[PDB]
Amino acid sequence: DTEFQALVEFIEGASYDQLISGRRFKKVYDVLSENDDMFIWLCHTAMSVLNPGDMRSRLIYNHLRILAESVASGEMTQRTAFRFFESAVRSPAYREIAKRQLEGGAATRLAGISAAADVMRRMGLTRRPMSSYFELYQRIVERSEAMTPWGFPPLFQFEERLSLEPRLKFFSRARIFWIPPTWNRAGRFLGPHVTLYPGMTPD
Amino acid sequence: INSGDQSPYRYVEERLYSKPSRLDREGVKVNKTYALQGLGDLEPLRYGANFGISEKDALKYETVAEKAKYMEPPIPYSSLAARKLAAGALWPAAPDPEGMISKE
Amino acid sequence: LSSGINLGRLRLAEQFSSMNGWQSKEDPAFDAYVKERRRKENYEAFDQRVERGYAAAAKLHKAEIQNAVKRRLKSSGAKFTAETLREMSSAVTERLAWLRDVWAQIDADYRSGDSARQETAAQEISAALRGEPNDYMRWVYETKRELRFAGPVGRRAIQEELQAAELPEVLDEEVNRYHDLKLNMMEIEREVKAKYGVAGQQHWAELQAAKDEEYI
Amino acid sequence: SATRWLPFVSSDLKDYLNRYWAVMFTVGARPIETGHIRHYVSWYCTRMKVVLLDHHVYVEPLRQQLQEASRTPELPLLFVNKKLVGTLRDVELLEREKKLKDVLHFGFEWRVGGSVAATNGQKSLMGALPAPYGDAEFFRGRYRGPPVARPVVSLPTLHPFAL
Amino acid sequence: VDTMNVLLTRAARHEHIQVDDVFLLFDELVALGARPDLAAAETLHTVLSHSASMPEEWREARRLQLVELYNNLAMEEVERLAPHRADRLLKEQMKRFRGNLQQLGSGLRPTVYCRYLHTTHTAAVLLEEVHNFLWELVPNDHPAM
Amino acid sequence: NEKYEPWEHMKRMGRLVGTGFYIPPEWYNHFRMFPPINHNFQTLSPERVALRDELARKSRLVASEGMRYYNIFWVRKPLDTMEKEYYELKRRGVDHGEAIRKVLQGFYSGLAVKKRVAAIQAEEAKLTGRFITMREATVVLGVLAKLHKEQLT
Amino acid sequence: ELRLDLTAQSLKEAWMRVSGGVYFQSVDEYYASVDGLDAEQIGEVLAALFPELNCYEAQALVQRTLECISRPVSAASRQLSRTITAEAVGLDNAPGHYTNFLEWMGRLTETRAFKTEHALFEFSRRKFNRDDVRVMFENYRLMSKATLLADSADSYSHFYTVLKDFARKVAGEDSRHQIGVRIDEAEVDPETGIAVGRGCADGEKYHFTALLRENRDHNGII
């Protein structure tokens, strides 16, 4: 019960100081967000759009299930797991299966994410035993990976480069992206050490 | 936010987006608390904890080419990225179109 | 290739494609499969808190067996081959089977209906969830070391007393890992100040006096 | 490079949709409504093909086919990912509902219920859970929110196309 | 009134309660200083119509109380919507009070009608309410001119 | 970058475990049995169309510029009979242009006969004064309506 | 809604009088979701007992009788249909699987753990003032260490006791109250009917005391 300990030390510190400080709230924002349920929900939302009768979908399903169990066990770090996930997502077979599920009409991704929440409850992939159903409700009623048509969060890192080229207008046409140092006046604190990203402004 | 003989816009800009602020976020022991401590979903996604850019790993490289060569690719998705996706804050809203009205 | 296996895979793929073709009372073979799976699930399932306690205890036992294999390979200096991995996986699976057979009793006592059985089962579940190790494992390690260091009369007596008691197959490295751990000083101090009173405090004061004399 | 440069032209609407990501069919007599869609699409850094229907060789084939995809005879029309976005009343709605980013970049619209335009600070649920037995109006002492201010008279707008 | 509205609703949906204790709770809250509104009156009218295990003198006692309650509620909203010139809004309120009492086997009192007619502002609603008054005493299968 | 790849990471983990002094995690053996997914190693008949084009282009000049007949009724039966007359002439296989000349002469005869039949019926409808067509009826009920709108003014 | 819930509750205990005591539901009949009464049996009752009952009201009644026998009736799938549409999840031609999910998610919302996880979510989204933290301090100090261990045996009982007032606030306009201005008692002289009010300006220069009485002859003057 480390999150309850962080909650009660926040409560005692904010009642001792008679104000809501930034250090105490930063501490409890870091304790309440150290869980790896985000990547497990990414893998399970990618597993939900698959087909239980197809053998290629069985291979992708077992691969992403093993990946989620490896992240939940702590034996694999986050960045290599994101490399495995973006390699499994960018495949043409997975996009073909997602397109077939979209063109079906009575899609089985809702039962997929429901069984995913049940599996995350049973296998102990969460911090609390009934948090997976509230996270399922959060994935459904908000803009997330569950409401995307393909089953991954809509960032350009999870989409192919051949689809990234004709839509977006990036630096030059016909990895890590940086501002070249010929721009001496780009912004107030913008410089060559400030990275840029294709489909989002993280600032 | 307490200004301290400065404009508050430029003071919050210096406390958010300057180099000692993000290095204090990574942990350097700078002079006195250049970054904002307690921010929830209002924290910029560049300086999140689960993000893939850390300036402490980037201080050992003397060139931007070495940073482009040796550094790992950044982590695409995080919890703060999920909250900004649910809020629609991945891209700023389009302002009023200044292309054809005037320059008053 | 329009063969039997390929056409079977094709009709399986188009069956589970939408939501319609695989529901209840629609396909009899899938209904028989889910009936047999739910029939086995009706017998080999536990209560949910029993399953959480079993998951924690199974994680601890798997970690302890892996630590035993690490200690054996660290002391012997040998390499980790596929045969050691096969041995470790076999020992882990038989320990998980033994833990299932143990926690079946705790699930039966938690679902018995008596007050004392349910309270002892809740005590076992709360001890497993907090990470507290079992005293049965301590007794098993101690009686394995005493079986190792006894003579043949005592060895035959222990082997004849415990032949019918279903004991887990414990390696020597687990007993050596339990034995070679240093004892906690503050727990011994708390036990000697709870079991004995001011005499225990004077004994601990003269013990700290001997410690500071050996420091000199 | 390997072939000489040629301007693309076709008498079919779907040949434009299968070629470009974002196509817009404007007229020269409507310069304001095409300029707002130029501002919105270039804000999200999206490559766009603008087709001025004035002085075109296939006007009557294209004016008929734009009447079938969009039931309104309104120009300009935005077409992203072989779908119909619509005129300015549809583009400004997706910008107001914060849906124009994922429409232009990834070719889909969010079907999530609820609006993200009316937010206070960060976005959370804050009462999106279903209430037992309803009765959201029969609590008369319920929390109504912060006091909202409204203008007495409408200020003079700077331009008729300022928006 | 929000105390009485949530107590009369969520006790009627309770399983082990008896229907007299719902009306015993309503008599306590109106003695403690809670004004009855249209929302709490319709919940008592529904729990009266879904109560037949009680004796018929108990059902007629609560029917006369609900007739008095709907007549006092109709008179109170007539005096409240009079100076706002809300005769179109007051028309839909009196139509709801006519519908609640016709299901109860009664009608609105003519003292409420004499007050309602003297505060009318349009001649069309004046002639329409005596048209509703003459049709409330007779059933709907009655001959007419 | 290709130096961070799941196949490269699996090869690195495999040659790390193959020393014998590193212990494999469960995902290594579980990815040997389930490898990562790779992106590599993956109307009308036209002769009838031309026939109907030629016959329509040649009949448009006969009906509009030739006959000056714009209120023609039920044109599909003359067009289908000249089509089937062309097929009857193509059974015996006489020619191509001469068959079109003969079916155009038959089409001209049929259009002239239909014109004379309509003229005879219109003449007998105007001589007796007892019958009136529907177009005259709606034009009468329109002009009397407009005369009543003049009476409204 | 109160008509249909009271009608469905009337048929439930009338079925319990005629059945005679216990009614046990096994695993397989739970999966088929068949209770003791069929929809043919309940629809026969509503046609026989209630003469004046139309078609769409009768099938609405058999929907509530099936769900009131199993569990207490929860009005949560009607609200979930408004915030979650059918085409967002991908179930357009499956209305039966859509409504089976909406009551599955709706009954999952009404639990103690779901209200606890929503309160811990909104605590992380910074939706509390200093007033919420101070009452959470009183809720934590009232729990002793013996009471905390009984609540920490469950995964949510120790969290919910601190966040009980906060879960009421974040639930929206259903349970969060307005503060409102003060409404005191009237302080009027019972003999003369005179109420006394004070007013001040410039600190010490302007001090005024007003005595207010009700004029019944409408000749009021100041």
Q: Provide, as residue numbers in chain F, all residues whose Cβ is less than 8 Å from the Cβ of B73.
A: 1, 4
Residue G213, strand partner residues: G194
Question: Is G2 exposed, middle or buried, given 0-12, 13-18 or 19+ CB atoms closer than 10 A?
Answer: middle
Phi, psi of A143 (to 5 degrees): -70, 110
Residue D83, strand partner residues: D80
Closest CA of chain D from G158, distance in Å: 22
Is residue B95 classed as helix, strand or coil in its secondary structure?
coil
Nearest to A189 by CA among F63, D123, B10: B10
**Cβ F4–A92 below 8 Å, yes or no?**
no
Closest CA of chain A from B28, distance in Å: 17
Region of G203 (left: φ > 0; alpha: ψ -120 to 50; beta: rest) is left
CA angle A143, A145, A146 (to 5 degrees): 85
Chains G and C touch (3+ CB pairs under 8 A): yes
Mutate to test the interface with D, among G118, G173, G179, G183 (most CBs of D within 10 A): G173
DSSP G206: E
d(CA F133, CA F122): 9
User: Structure solved using which method?
Assistant: cryo-EM
**Cβ A143–D112 below 8 Å, yes or no?**
yes
Chain G residue with the nearest C-alpha to that of E9: G2
Q: CA torsion, points D105, D106, D110, D111, in degrees to nearest 10?
A: 150
Q: Return the number of other C-beta atoms located less than 10 Å from residue C105's C-beta.
A: 12
Chains that touch C (3 or more CB pairs under 8 A): A, F, G
Q: Is D102's Cβ below 8 Å from some Cβ in A?
A: yes
Phi, psi of C201 (to 5 degrees): -70, -40
d(CA G209, CA G198): 5
**Cβ D163–B41 below 8 Å, yes or no?**
no
Q: Provide, as residue numbers in chain C, all residues whose Cβ is less than 8 Å from the Cβ of A107.
A: 18-19
| Token reading at F50 | 């031309």
Q: Provide, as residue numbers in chain F, all residues whose Cβ is less than 8 Å from the Cβ of B72.
A: 4
End-to-end CA distance of chain G: 56
CB-closest option in G27, G32, G94 to C42: G27
Q: Is B5's Cβ below 8 Å from some Cβ in F?
A: no
End-to-end CA distance of chain F: 87
DSSP secondary structure string, chain F? --SS-HHHHHHHHHHHHTTSSSPPPHHHHHHHHSPPPPSS-----HHHHHHHHHHHHHHHIIIIIIS---S---THHHHHHHHHHHHHHHHHT--SHHHHHHHHHHHHHHHHHHHHHHHHHHHHHHHHSS---HHHHHHHHHHHHHHHHHHH-
Token look-up 């031609």 returns: G93
Nearest to D18 by CA among D40, D63, D57, D49: D49
d(CA D132, CA G174): 9
Chains C and F touch (3+ CB pairs under 8 A): yes
Closest CA of chain G from A131, distance in Å: 6
d(CA F27, CA F68): 87
Question: Is F39 exposed, middle or buried, given 0-12, 13-18 or 19+ CB atoms closer than 10 A?
Answer: exposed
d(CA F71, CA D152): 66
The secondary element (H helix, E strand) that includes residue D26 is strand D22-26
| Token reading at G195 | 């109420």
Q: Is A153's Cβ below 8 Å from some Cβ in B?
A: yes
Question: Is E30 exposed, middle or buried, given 0-12, 13-18 or 19+ CB atoms closer than 10 A?
Answer: middle
For residue A129, cis peptide bond before it (omega within 30 degrees of 0): no
- Kind of pairing, strands A195-196 and D22-26? unpaired
Q: Provide, as residue numbers in chain A, all residues whose Cβ is less than 8 Å from the Cβ of F17.
A: none
Chains that touch A (3 or more CB pairs under 8 A): B, C, D, F, G
Q: Provide, as residue numbers in chain B, all residues whose Cβ is less than 8 Å from the Cβ of A182.
A: none
Give me the residues of B, 49-78, that contact F with CB < 8 A: 72-73
Q: Is C24's Cβ below 8 Å from some Cβ in A?
A: no
User: What is the amino acid identity at position G59?
Assistant: Q
Which residues make Cβ contacts (< 8 Å) with residue E39, sequence separation at least 6?
D138, E5
Could you give the angle at which helices E38-49 and E87-102 cross, rounded to 10 degrees?
20
d(CA B89, CA C15): 41
Token look-up 């990234």 returns: A164
Q: Provide, as residue numbers in chain E, all residues whose Cβ is less than 8 Å from the Cβ of D138.
A: 2, 5-6, 39
Phi, psi of A131 (to 5 degrees): -80, -20
**Cβ F9–A83 below 8 Å, yes or no?**
yes
**Cβ E46–G3 below 8 Å, yes or no?**
yes
d(CA D123, CA B84): 8
| Token reading at B30 | 């700078």
Q: Provide, as residue numbers in chain E, all residues whose Cβ is less than 8 Å from the Cβ of D139.
A: 2, 6
**Cβ A104–C51 below 8 Å, yes or no?**
no
Nearest to C124 by CA among C136, C140, C142, C139: C136
Q: Is C41's Cβ below 8 Å from some Cβ in A?
A: no
Give me the residues of D, 93-152, that contact G with CB < 8 A: 111-114, 121-122, 124-136, 139, 141-144
Write G154-160 long-range contacts (CB < 8 A, 24+): G155/A128, G155/A129, G155/A130, G155/G113, G156/A128, G156/A130, G156/G112, G156/G113, G156/G116, G157/G112, G158/A1, G158/A4, G159/A4, G159/A7, G159/G116, G159/G119, G159/G120, G160/G112, G160/G115, G160/G116, G160/G119
Which residues make Cβ contacts (< 8 Å) with residue B17, sequence separation at least 6?
A188, A189, A203, B44
Distances (CA, A) of C57 to A127, C96, C125, G154: 17, 9, 10, 19
CA angle C154, C157, C158 (to 5 degrees): 90
Q: Is F21's Cβ below 8 Å from some Cβ in C?
A: yes
d(CA E47, CA D85): 53
d(CA E73, CA E101): 12
Chains C and E touch (3+ CB pairs under 8 A): no
Distances (CA, A) of F43 to B25, F74, F76: 70, 23, 18
d(CA C109, CA C114): 8
Chains that touch G (3 or more CB pairs under 8 A): A, B, C, D, E
Chain B residue with the nearest C-alpha to that of G127: B40
Strands (E) in chain G, as ranges, are 194-201, 206-213
**Cβ A141–D102 below 8 Å, yes or no?**
no
- For C113, half-sphere exposure in the C-beta direction (CA atoms, 13 angstrom radius) is 0
Give me the residues of G, 99-158, that contact C with CB < 8 A: 153
Is residue C210 classed as helix, strand or coil in its secondary structure?
helix
Nearest to F35 by CA among F5, F4, F2: F5
Q: How many cross-chain Cβ pairs, A to C, lie less than 8 Å apart?
A: 34
d(CA A154, CA A98): 14
